[PDB]
Amino acid sequence: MHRTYSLRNSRAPTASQLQNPPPPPSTTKGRFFGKGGLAYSFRRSAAGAFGPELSRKLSQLVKIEKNVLRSMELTANERRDAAKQLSIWGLENDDDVSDITDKLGVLIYEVSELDDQFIDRYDQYRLTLKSIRDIEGSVQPSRDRKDKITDKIAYLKYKDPQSPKIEVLEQELVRAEAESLVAEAQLSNITRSKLRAAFNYQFDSIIEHSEKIALIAGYGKALLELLDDSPVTPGETRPAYDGYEASKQIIIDAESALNEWTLDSAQVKPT
Amino acid sequence: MHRTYSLRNSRAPTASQLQNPPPPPSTTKGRFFGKGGLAYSFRRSAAGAFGPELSRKLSQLVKIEKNVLRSMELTANERRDAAKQLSIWGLENDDDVSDITDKLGVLIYEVSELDDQFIDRYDQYRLTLKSIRDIEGSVQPSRDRKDKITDKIAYLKYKDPQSPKIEVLEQELVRAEAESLVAEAQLSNITRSKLRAAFNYQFDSIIEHSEKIALIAGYGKALLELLDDSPVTPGETRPAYDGYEASKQIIIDAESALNEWTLDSAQVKPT
Amino acid sequence: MHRTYSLRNSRAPTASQLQNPPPPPSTTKGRFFGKGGLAYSFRRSAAGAFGPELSRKLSQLVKIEKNVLRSMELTANERRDAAKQLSIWGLENDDDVSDITDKLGVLIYEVSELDDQFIDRYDQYRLTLKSIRDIEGSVQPSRDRKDKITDKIAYLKYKDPQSPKIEVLEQELVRAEAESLVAEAQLSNITRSKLRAAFNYQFDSIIEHSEKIALIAGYGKALLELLDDSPVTPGETRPAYDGYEASKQIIIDAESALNEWTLDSAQVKPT
Amino acid sequence: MHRTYSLRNSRAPTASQLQNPPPPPSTTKGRFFGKGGLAYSFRRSAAGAFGPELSRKLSQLVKIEKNVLRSMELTANERRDAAKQLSIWGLENDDDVSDITDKLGVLIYEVSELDDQFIDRYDQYRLTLKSIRDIEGSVQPSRDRKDKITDKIAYLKYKDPQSPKIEVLEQELVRAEAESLVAEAQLSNITRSKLRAAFNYQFDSIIEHSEKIALIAGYGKALLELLDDSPVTPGETRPAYDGYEASKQIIIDAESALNEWTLDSAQVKPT
């Protein structure tokens, strides 16, 4: 949607893009459907199946959100595995390198834990959407019966103008219309309420998790200053790294700001 | 790591947790290994295989990062699919609901695009780690040959104290020691440089993407105020929604702040 | 490109769309490639063939423009055939209907003649683009030879640092570089000149033809007022149509404004 | 719990660890369950069996404490056997070596006797916990009957709103609620009292036994100064050891301080 007014689907570069040019496209693009294969697309296909034809789209969205959740669960546990592997690799290295890589590993572990909490809040969002899907599916048969009744009464009117069955189904249809009006009014109310609440909670969760992980990334950037990037000539060895206390103080302050973080202290501000 | 001083692996609740209690654990936990099956664990197993035994851990980390990248690619394209499906579902709904859900869909599309950019920067990180892995693997055979030579010269010294072969291999080993000292000095220098640069770039990328997505979430929260959550009684219909201009102004301001965003204008601040 | 900021390729409705809703999509969409079949796509395929690899895109554009011209020629002659058929159909009808349909037929004939003139100016545009394509194709072998020479001199430098052939090809390459600089400077100049002139002439031609056909359509709309749309009851016949003089005066004034039309009298004005 | 803020379960080294590096892990780790086999795990399994489902955890803890007591009894008698064996081995050795090893053996015998006294106090602790377990098990059926009665009255309310049985069980349930409130109040009081008293007595016993054994270890360290560690050249024999009186005085003073030890004279002081 950010594409410029040209013939190319090229997004307009932001100030960050001008500051640092965008990198080349990733080489990880594999020759695959990109939906987890037929095994993971079985759920997607089953979403588009014999349903109430009304919550079909909503049920499909819910099951797609379940796929989202499964993928995020896959990238959280295996990311914390990556952090563990990074610490294991940094075990046998320079003392400053080992300390700094262990601190980066623990920061990534914090990242994975926040991802898991975001996953739980995502499941709350998905459960609210499941509730709205189920109430919509329960309210659909009312309108289905309404459509069937109006079609049958139209056919009966075609057959003759004085069948008692005609008047009886008209009398039942005036009841069905009122019940369907009430059902659709409450359906609109519940859909609006669930939609607003679920998406407000979802956006609050994502902004909280994202600003928290950004607060973590800033602390990690500050921590990365401890190691010295000055190259050392072959032969003599550089002085030993004694910044253990500084790194521990940095991680302590990061923990303190992490625990102190609250919705009131949301330094992110729109304009 | 955030667990309290008890016998349970229960993290200390932050101020957000006190404000709103944590949700129950997700029900999406499936009975599976959680590593993409044996097909996706084949790469992990092949990482732990006949290698230079030094970059084995680093190569394993690189391939794990590739799995991270593949999972993120899976959750980006399929998340934008979820946004498209959400817009399709909101097609047939209330005018305010349709407009607001289309705007949420476009915000999620922005989220997916930022995820793709983060994936490209992640691939830059992974390529830098590939470079460091390859230089470490190229420098390992020096120390391997050193170990073999010292073992053989020890055995030859055991056999006799005056073999010419002994003195010749000692003379070659004093050269190998100097070349290995130079190789290890440059190895330490290149590892420190690549590590610092790659992880500083990675943390800058993640903080940029995260604060940007948080800036997006805040704008979405402000946008969600447009719809009215007041329930409507059955019968009469609420007044029509004319806040199209307000929503378009909100999205225009979001685009303006998106393009204006720069590293200098990083309102996230550590302490 | 006019699509709104949503997930749909739906263009933003203009004031005309609000005034009158857009019609449903045309039912003439056939199950075909839409490029005139393989017979008409043979030229397109031959455009992408063994060429100078530089004017390949420009030659493809020229041949596509030739297809444009052929299609326009098809719709001009056969449109004037449609006008003739309309007059033939209106031969046996009411006197007012016959006169008005003959006048509409002659207006459509004027439309077809203006289309033919637009086709001739289009051929002028295509010939200018053919000229620019041919000069670009003639200038490409200079850079092709430059690339070949630099590759060969790089290989020769690899072989040895003192071959006389090396210095001779360097001396010829410094000449080739100067001639290629001159060739590219004149190529840029001629491309800019031809591009600006051809497209300015093309846009002047299209605005002239379009505003002329619009001036024709307005006169036709004024002429359509002559016939009476008031329904007539069965039985008695409505009074005879005597507006022959009015229709002839309208067509005379249309001819006068047609001949008087000039680029100076271009009442279309941008802002 | 003492692990640092890293990815490893490595405890933070104390000042003693810096003074002397920690030894390598023990080689006595056998390939076994570590719970005394299935014979000693039969009691543990029987703890988790058909019980009042409330004191199940407490009964399991009590039986685990019994296993603790049995293991300590095993290591006390067999440790005093080790001391006897040490004296037997030192029977045929140097006079100073024989005397010093006999004194170490008697110190270890004192250690075993203090261990036996600690075992008796441990049994006092276990008996207090048995008492609290038994009162909790006796109070559980009250709440079990309460739950059964409320379930049955809910079902009866489902069946009809006017069964006399309903009102009779409500009248009995208001009595059961009051008796359960009294039972839970006295249960909380007795649990708090028994818990505080038993664990205060247990901690006093362990600090007394530990500081006593430390007072013993210090005296043994002072006693070890009697023997001479200076190596003797082959040939002539070092002067005979006449420090029998010094060793007897040391053991006499150790006995005097042992008998004089009291809770008031607890030189161990927290801060």
- List the structure tokens of B13: 């609740």
A4: closest CA of chain C, how far (Å)? 9
Distance CA B187, CA B130 (A): 14
- List the structure tokens of A115: 């991802």
Distance of CA D231 to the CA centre of its chain: 43
Burial class (CB in 10 A: 0-12, 13-18, 19+), C205: middle
Burial class (CB in 10 A: 0-12, 13-18, 19+), C158: exposed
What residues in chain D have their Cβ under 8 A from chain A's Cβ atoms?
A: 5-8
- CB-nearest partner of C8 from B87, B103, B251: B87
The method recorded for this entry reads cryo-EM
Which residues in chain A have their CB less than 8 angstroms from residue D5's CB? 106, 248, 251
Distance CA D237, CA D256 (A): 36
What element of type H or E holds C212? helix C164-223
| Binary contact (B105, C6; C-beta < 8 A) | yes
| B100 touches C20 (CB < 8 A) | no
- CB-nearest partner of B57 from A29, A74, A85: A85
What element of type H or E holds A112? helix A95-159
Q: A: neighbours with 3+ CB pairs under 8 Å?
A: B, C, D
Residue whose token pair is 């006093």: D204
Question: Hey, what's the torsion of the CAs at D144, D146, D152, D155, to 10 degrees?
Answer: -110
Distance CA D261, CA D186 (A): 39
| Binary contact (D7, A106; C-beta < 8 A) | yes
Distance CA C180, CA C54 (A): 15
B120: closest CA of chain A, how far (Å)? 5
Between the alpha carbon of residue B46 and those of residues B41, B63, B139, C262, the distances in Å are 8, 9, 21, 78
What element of type H or E holds D253? helix D244-260
Sequence-distant (6+) residues with CB within 8 A of D220 are D103, D104, D107
Which residues in chain C have their CB less than 8 angstroms from residue B248's CB? 5
Residue in A216, A229, A74, A90 with CA at minimum distance from that of residue B61: A90
Q: What chain C residue is nearest to A2 in terms of C-alpha separation?
A: C5
Return the axis-axis angle of helices B244-260 and B164-223, rounded to nearest 10°.
Answer: 150
What residues in chain A have their Cβ under 8 A from chain C's Cβ atoms?
A: 1, 5, 7
Entry resolution in angstroms? 3.6
Distance CA C132, CA C136 (A): 6
| Binary contact (A5, C5; C-beta < 8 A) | no
Beta bridge partners of C11: C3
Our answer on whether D and C touch (3+ beta-carbon pairs < 8 Å) is: no
Q: Can you give the three-state secondary structure of D95-140, one letter per residue? A: HHHHHHHHHHHHHHHHHHHHHHHHHHHHHHHHHHHHHHHHHHHHHH
Which residues in chain D have their CB less than 8 angstroms from residue A251's CB? 5
Sequence-distant (6+) residues with CB within 8 A of A210 are B210, B211, B213, B214, B217
| A98 touches A88 (CB < 8 A) | no
Q: Nearest 5°: phi and psi at B30?
A: -95, 160
| A146 touches A107 (CB < 8 A) | no
Which DSSP string corresponds to C76-138? HHHHHHHHHHHHHHHTSS-HHHHHHHHHHHHHHHHHHHHHHHHHHHHHHHHHHHHHHHHHHHH
Which DSSP string corresponds to D164-185? HHHHHHHHHHHHHHHHHHHHHH
Distance CA D240, CA D227 (A): 11
Which DSSP string corresponds to B20-76? SPPPPPPTT--SS-SSSHHHHHHHHHHHSSSS-SSTHHHHHHHHHHHHHHHHHHHHH
Query: Which residue out of C3, C4, C5 would a mutagenesis test of the B interface target, given it has the greatest number of B Cβ atoms within 10 Å?
Result: C5
What residues in chain A have their Cβ under 8 A from chain D's Cβ atoms?
A: 83-84, 87, 102, 105-106, 109, 248, 251
What residues in chain C have their Cβ under 8 A from chain A's Cβ atoms?
A: 1, 5
Distance CA B2, CA A110 (A): 8
H helix and E strand count, chain A: 6, 0
| C140 touches C52 (CB < 8 A) | yes
Distance CA B195, CA B187 (A): 12
Distance CA A85, CA B61 (A): 6
Distance CA B188, CA B135 (A): 11
